[PDB]
Amino acid sequence: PLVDMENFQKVEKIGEGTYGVVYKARNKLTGEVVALKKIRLDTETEGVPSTAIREISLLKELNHPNIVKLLDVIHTENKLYLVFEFLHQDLKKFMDASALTGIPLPLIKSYLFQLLQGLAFCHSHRVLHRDLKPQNLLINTEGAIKLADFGLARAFGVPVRTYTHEVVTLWYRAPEILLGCKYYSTAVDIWSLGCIFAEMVTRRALFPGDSEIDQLFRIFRTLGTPDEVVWPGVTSMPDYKPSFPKWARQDFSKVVPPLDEDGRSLLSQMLHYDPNKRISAKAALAHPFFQDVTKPVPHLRL
């Protein structure tokens, strides 16, 4: 246990968080560079956190090039360490650093492609990510991108119930969730992905809501307030209000101007209101948008 921890040299702090701290570190014996997520177990005396339980148990089942690798788990008397492969940057910082120039469309296509592959793998293995946002996506100098941060992930061999607290940050939250649906479905991860796709393309968040109601309105104002014909059952949902304003759908070529016909087509299918009709990661991968996908390398300002 503590023997393994002695073989690690702390390099520098990567990030913070509730669960604990993540450090870039090096295996002294092998030279392998890794990310060490340190979890203190005396900050609640509630045992191993539910998030660690889930991230660990689900992640060790997911081995795919586009999903962050959990290399090891060290459980001491009062500390829990998760050892991950290391990647140079996260999508949020990169988007931030690309503000002036924007991310080239070919790289954007490559990233979406890889993200869908990673997501399809998760879903075909009954795992819902539930927290897809720029910050949780890792990228390296080779041009690969991987899903990370499976703290809120969940197995859905049995339907997953909706929880008020454990939910995606507002901006990437699917409409079904905002309207108060009972269970999550793979559709919520696809929705988050569509929002990220659009953000990369335009350089601005698609639906930057200030509150739950404001988030819904942002979505309605762009995609149109949904009705029974568009989304059967919507008017019966828990948080739906007949007093909701009735907005008309904005033309897609004006929402994501730099996108071509295929891009606009894929995006609208990823943002379909009815979760049963929202495209799946698997089917998205077959879309003609990825007809000419390649693997460019990003310009990382490290």
Partner: protein, 258 residues
Amino acid sequence: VPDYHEDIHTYLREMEVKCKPKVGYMKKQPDITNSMRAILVDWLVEVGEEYKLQNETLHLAVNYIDRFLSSMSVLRGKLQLVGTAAMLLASKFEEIYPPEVAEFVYITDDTYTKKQVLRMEHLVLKVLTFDLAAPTVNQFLTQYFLHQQPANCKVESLAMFLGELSLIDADPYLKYLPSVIAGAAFHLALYTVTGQSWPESLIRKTGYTLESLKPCLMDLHQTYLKAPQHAQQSIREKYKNSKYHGVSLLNPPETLNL
């Protein structure tokens, strides 16, 4: 019907074969018996009812307990500590917000300490190597229900009832995979309530014929018949509630005419 419905069933079938405990582990335990296990599980059902936990939580905990006992010798007075820790972990994995450890210490009538429970959690995690996402009868039934055009709530409650009863007796359920137990429970429930049998769609989906389910079916039918006489009754009581359409009160058919 979902889009990954098939991929998932295939993967669940793969994983159930791996999280499988040793069938003959109880004979190798020097101090505990099947009856002691029966009493433990029955107790977990009550705990689950007391804290309103999902049924899936119950099934995971039993799976954790049977895997743990397949490699660790445990004494009478420690069996309950292992089960308490198993329920704690299962709750953390499946519940939206699990009960605090203090609650789990309470339901043991302070037989153990918060310290002992947390230490046993660590040991169980180590022994299972953090592989907590195991396939359960509950999960297979769920997948099976989507293949039911005549969606019947009574059929579902009853299948769930029969699936839950199998948890109580290591003999002879330990020797059956979750997908098989689910299959037998599904057919038995469908037969009792609607007179219908294992559907052609599930034969194609699972590859299990009514013939292949027979050995387990005969056992499950027997458990159903004797259900009222069983030493453990927490499950029957639970399924008397209207929430489950009082299916534990339904009379089991006399024969299966297979």
